[PDB]
């Protein structure tokens, strides 16, 4: 253990550490990226589901109607005074609550992390003078 | 390259570990913070998507019975030894298979990194005796 | 400050720094895993929903074409010329847009990290010759 030694150690821990900073802000930038598409992809097939849902009631609603005048014109033909079938109560969907993801604050916190991470390099310059 | 110097250089390469150490655990509380939004938008979806499948069935169902009334109707009122049009079969939706977002296990593990980073500070007390 | 005392200090860096390595893959593991996740749950409630549309589609259908042979069956019966009420248009669902995670860049990107942060562990040998 010489001093010519502790200090080609300290480039050796410097070195490391410069190494796995590199890593750190991949994998960070990566779950950004990746985090970008969880979201885009949640909110693009509730929103695909909260349209069916009003496509749905509107079918529903053509249909019911329908019904309900072939109800009216088999009364019209049997002549008893409306004591057929009643015209039937269909209901109604419950409107869709659907969860919009909004990972805005997250992924900006991501992107300064990464920024971070860059500020925390060990310049081989500041060492040994 | 003197001793002050190079234990100059200690107290730099420390400062800038623990720097660093900051900026990880900030990234992976906000992905923790991240995941759990995510995991309960997807939760929110599916079982709105299950709960309008079951209230669809529901929905078919008495426009089945409606239709199968109205058919009957129509025969007696044809007289034709039901000759007419039969009763069509509408079938049935498929169960929906929805699949729940369950990441305890991996936000309890992410806790605990940032838990464990927080291990790894370098006291500056210990250094230089 | 001796000489001892800065190689000891280079060993406290040294082995805070390898701490913290570990928690890092545990954290980019986890979160790698929890993406796993996210991304069949996501495209498994979404192939549910393409399903069910169109199963959806199926059964508006035959109820439509059900509803229009009673109209015809109403019509022979009513001796009107065809002067009842028309047979209704009942449209058809939008065709569901679903969007589909494929996060198998970013999942190869982050076992890659893991894998790059273990070439970064400061081995022990390698310090005080």
Do not use: C, H, W
Request: charged share 15%; hydrophobic share 40%; net charge negative.
């Amino acid at each position: 253990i010489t001093q010519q030694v502790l200090s080609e150690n300290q480039k050796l821990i410097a070195n490391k550490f410069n190494q796995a900073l590199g890593a750190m802000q991949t994998g960070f930038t990566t779950t950004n990226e990746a985090f970008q598409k969880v979201q885009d992809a949640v909110n693009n097939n509730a929103q695909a589901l909260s349209k069916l849902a009003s496509e749905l009631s509107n079918t529903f609603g053509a249909i019911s109607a329908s019904i309900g005048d072939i109800i009216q014109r088999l009364d019209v033909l049997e002549q008893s005074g409306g004591r057929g079938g009643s015209i039937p109560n269909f209901g109604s969907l419950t409107q869709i609550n659907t969860t919009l993801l909004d990972l805005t604050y997250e992924m900006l916190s991501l992107q300064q992390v990464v920024k971070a991470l860059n500020e925390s390099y060990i310049d081989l310059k500041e060492l040994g003078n």
